[PDB]
Amino acid sequence: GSSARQSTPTSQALYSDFSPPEGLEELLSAPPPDLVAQRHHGWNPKDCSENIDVKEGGLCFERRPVAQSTDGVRGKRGYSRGLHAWEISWPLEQRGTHAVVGVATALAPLQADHYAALLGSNSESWGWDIGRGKLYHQSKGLEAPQYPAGPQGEQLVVPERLLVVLDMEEGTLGYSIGGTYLGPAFRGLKGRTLYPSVSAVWGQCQVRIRYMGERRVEETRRIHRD
C-alpha cells in the first residue's frame, strides 16, 4: 500500500527476467532416477518440463525448486515419423489453473490471412489457449444468458479431455476430442499443418496425457520393410 514512507520501486518496462536457472541442470546432469526417464515417459512432449519429474500412477508432476523454471513449461517442435496420435486432459477440479497447448507453423505464409490482409513476421502459431476464458471476455458473451454453459467454449478451452491426432506420413495433425473436429479440416491442414506443442502449468492442474503410436528406438526388433 502507501500509508508509510519507505516503499519499494516496482517498475520494469520490458519483457520478463526474474531468476533464470544456472546450477540445477548440474543436479539433473547426474544419474536422474525416475525423473529423467519417468518424466519423459509421463507427460513429456519435448521442450516441456524436463528438469522436473512427472510419473503416471496418478498424473503427478514433480519439480525440485519452483515453477520459476521446473514447472510452467511447454514442449514445441517434437518431430516424429509415421502416423500417430496422443491424448491430453486438464483437471481443473483443483481450484484455479489454465491448460495451454497449440501447434506452431514456420512455413505459415501471409497473403490473404483468414481475416483479410494485415502483414507477416517470421512464423505463425495457432492452437488452443485458455486466454479466451480469462476475465478479458465475460460481460460481452453471447453464451446462454440463462444458465452457465457454452459449446463454442471448447474451441480453445476443454477442461476435461482431448484427443490430438498427428501423422507425419502425411504431415497433417490437428486437435479434437474423441476425434470430433478433425474430419473436414484435413483438406486444408495438408498445407496448414504446424508443429504440435503443449504447455503445462504448476503441478496443481497436473494435465493428463495418453499417447499411442510413439515408442523409443534402442534395439528391440522393429519393422524393417517400409
- Taking the alpha carbons at both ends of the chain, their separation in whole angstroms is 68
**Distance of alpha carbon 50 from the chain centroid:** 14
Of 214, 84, 225, 88, which is closest to residue 158 (Cα–Cα)? 88
- If DSSP codes are grouped into helix, strand and coil, which group holds residue 80? coil
Q: Which residues of 162-179 are buried (b: 16+ CB within 10 A; e: fewer)?
A: bbbbbbeeeebbbbbbee
Q: How far apart are CA 165 and CA 186, in angstroms?
A: 11
Grid coordinates given for 146: 440463462
Experimental method: NMR
CA distance 223 to 142: 52
Cα distances from 76 to residues 53, 96, 115, 196, 198, in angstroms, run: 18, 24, 26, 6, 7
Give residue 81's identity as a one-letter amino acid code. R
Distance CA 74, CA 53 (A): 14
| Alpha carbons 91 and 207: distance in angstroms, whole number | 6
Classified as helix, coil or strand, 195 is: strand
Look at residues 16, 204, 207 and name the one whose alpha carbon lies nearest to residue 101: 207
- Burial of 59 from C-beta contacts in 10 A (0-12 / 13-18 / 19+): middle
Residue 74, exposed/middle/buried by CB under 10 A (0-12, 13-18, 19+)?
Answer: middle
The C-alpha cell that represents 41 in the structure block: 515417459
Strand 208-212 versus strand 100-105 pairing type:
unpaired
Q: Whole-angstrom Cα distance, residue 199 to residue 8? A: 33
CB 120 within 8 A of CB 106: no
Strands 83-89 and 208-212, how do they pair? antiparallel
Residue among 108, 106, 110, 150 at smallest CA distance from 132? 150
